[PDB]
Amino acid sequence: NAQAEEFKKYLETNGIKPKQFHKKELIFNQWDPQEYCIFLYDGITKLTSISENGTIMNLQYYKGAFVIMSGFIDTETSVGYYNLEVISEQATAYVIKINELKELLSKNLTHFFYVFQTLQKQVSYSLAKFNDFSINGKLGSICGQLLILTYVYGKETPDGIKITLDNLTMQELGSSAVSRIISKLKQEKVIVYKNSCFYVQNLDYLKRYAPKLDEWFYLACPATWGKLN
Amino acid sequence: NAQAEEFKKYLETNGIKPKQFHKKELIFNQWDPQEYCIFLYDGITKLTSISENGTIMNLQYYKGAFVIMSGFIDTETSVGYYNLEVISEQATAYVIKINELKELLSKNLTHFFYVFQTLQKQVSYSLAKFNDFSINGKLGSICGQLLILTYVYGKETPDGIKITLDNLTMQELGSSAVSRIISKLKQEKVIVYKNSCFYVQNLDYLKRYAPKLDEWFYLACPATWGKLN
Ligand SMILES: O=C(O)[C@@H]1CSc2c(C3CC3)c(Cc3cccc4ccccc34)cc(=O)n21
Ligand SMILES: O=C(O)[C@@H]1CSc2c(C3CC3)c(Cc3cccc4ccccc34)cc(=O)n21
């Protein structure tokens, strides 16, 4: 990822320091009155929300390299009250106060375009995710998440496509319908737990029920989309 | 909105003329290889997708003033295959090719920050609606749709809070489960349909089953929010 490495070197040049985090750590949480811009350089995270009675809802997953913002770039108001939690064993992130960001981007348009693009990818990603929900219900959503996991962590092997993630991360990613659906897929040999990993066979089935996410990845990450097609 | 008028002027300074469109026109369509930046200024539109078997998925609805983009500003490549379709009677929209946009934003960052912040509102908007549907099901959706109508088109009346839309537009966007929900909201007199118009008289019930959208209106459109609170 060329833009990402360039954005790292730009942040470090401007004196911004990389912070290590550990699983279950919160890079920011939903009560913080400091709005941040997080450049997640390495790791896997989830955006969660905590409702008033304390039940946790998982909203979105992110992966390095990527930008996540808790405030609006001009106002430096919260965009929404959320937590960003680390779910891989480690993660590396550059934490930037919102207003510092405005300055950093103002003085370099290339980086500004890059950050802007990361927003565009979230917007196109949620359109595609809503599309596949609209057609195939939860089946759209499970397949969609399995498909991206495969494109991003799948190693072609005679065994199929191995999803290269130690199990703890897979458990952090994953009800009635679910069990019955995840059932159906195992039953149908789309995925297999063999040799202690998931291995994916019917990539075509994933693509069928999550078509828009297939397209979205093709446009967003073409080089990666090519390696399994 | 202030930022909205000023970007309209900047666009006309740089020679972008408003193009008028009428109900059911495609502002752009998915096969068009030209990536665009649509600044919807007035009217209502919807983004749609066309799955292969030909069914038209409604993905999102938009209201002037707002920004819709069909290419990534950095690589200038397609963000997806979409159609942008008018559903109001007429709408005012400035259509800018993606390369010309990038130049316009590059020479005035104020406007760059406005467009950037517009996509940020779009990101958290869809997370908020998703939080509400995951927590409260269709009651969360329905209560979200009506909350939306209320803030944007809610004109306070003795009869309560009227929804100021020609009732063919209403009728353009609007099942078994749905009717059980509206059946109840009509019975408990949270909404009243009289004189062929919707009215709202318990704003606080809606805020209960859609607390993330309510919270989103507050952080992203405080002016609108505060008017009704
Ligand atoms: O990392 C990237 O540049 C690409 C392009 S934008 C994106 C996303 C979208 C949230 C913005 C995701 C999210 C995602 C989807 C499905 C499974 C995931 C598993 C782990 C982490 C994130 C996941 C993933 C992703 O790779 N990308
Ligand atoms: O609001 C819009 O103009 C579109 C059309 S109705 C909708 C929703 C639904 C709650 C009513 C959402 C939220 C949402 C629900 C279910 C699955 C989702 C999957 C991904 C993202 C959001 C999801 C978002 C949204 O944009 N819209």
Residue numbers in the entry:
A (entry chain A), B (entry chain B): 2 to 175, 183 to 237
How do the authors describe this structure?
The transcriptional activator PrfA, a member of the Crp/Fnr family, controls the expression of some key virulence factors necessary for infection by the human bacterial pathogen Listeria monocytogenes. Structurally, each monomer of PrfA comprises an N-terminal eight-stranded β-barrel domain connected by an α helix linker to a C-terminal α/β domain (Eiting et al., 2005, Vega et al., 2004). The C-terminal region contains the winged helix-turn-helix (HTH) motif responsible for binding to consensus promoter sequences (Eiting et al., 2005, Vega et al., 2004). While most Crp family members require a small molecule cofactor for DNA binding (e.g., cAMP for Crp in Escherichia coli) (Won et al., 2009), PrfA is capable of binding to its DNA consensus sequences with low affinity even in the absence of a cofactor (Eiting et al., 2005).
To understand the structural basis for inhibition, we determined the crystal structure of the PrfAWT-1 complex at a resolution of 2.25 Å. The PrfAWT-1 complex was co-crystallized in the space group P21 where the asymmetric unit contains one biological dimer: monomers A and B. Binding of 1 to PrfAWT was confirmed at two sites, AI in monomer A and BII in monomer B, from difference Fourier electron density maps. Site AI is found at the so-called interdomain tunnel in monomer A, situated between the N- and C-terminal domains. Compound 1 binds with high occupancy at site AI, but no ligand bound to the tunnel in monomer B (i.e., to the BI site). At binding site AI the carboxylate is in close proximity with the charged ɛ-amino groups of Lys64 and Lys122, indicating the potential for both electrostatic interactions and a network of hydrogen bonding, which in the case of Lys122 are mediated through the bulk solvent. The naphthyl ring occupies a hydrophobic part of the tunnel bounded by the peptide backbones of Tyr62, Gln146, Ile149, and Leu150, and the cyclopropyl motif is surrounded between the peptide backbone of Gln123 and the phenyl rings of Tyr63, Phe67, and Tyr126, respectively. The second high-occupancy binding site for compound 1, i.e., the BII site, is found at a hydrophobic pocket in the vicinity of the HTH motif in monomer B. The naphthyl group of compound 1 at site BII is sandwiched between the side chains of four phenylalanines: Phe131 and Phe134 from both monomers in the dimer. At this site the naphthyl group of compound 1 sterically prevents restructuring of residues Phe131 and Phe134 into positions needed for formation of an HTH motif compatible with DNA binding (Levy et al., 2008, Schultz et al., 1991).
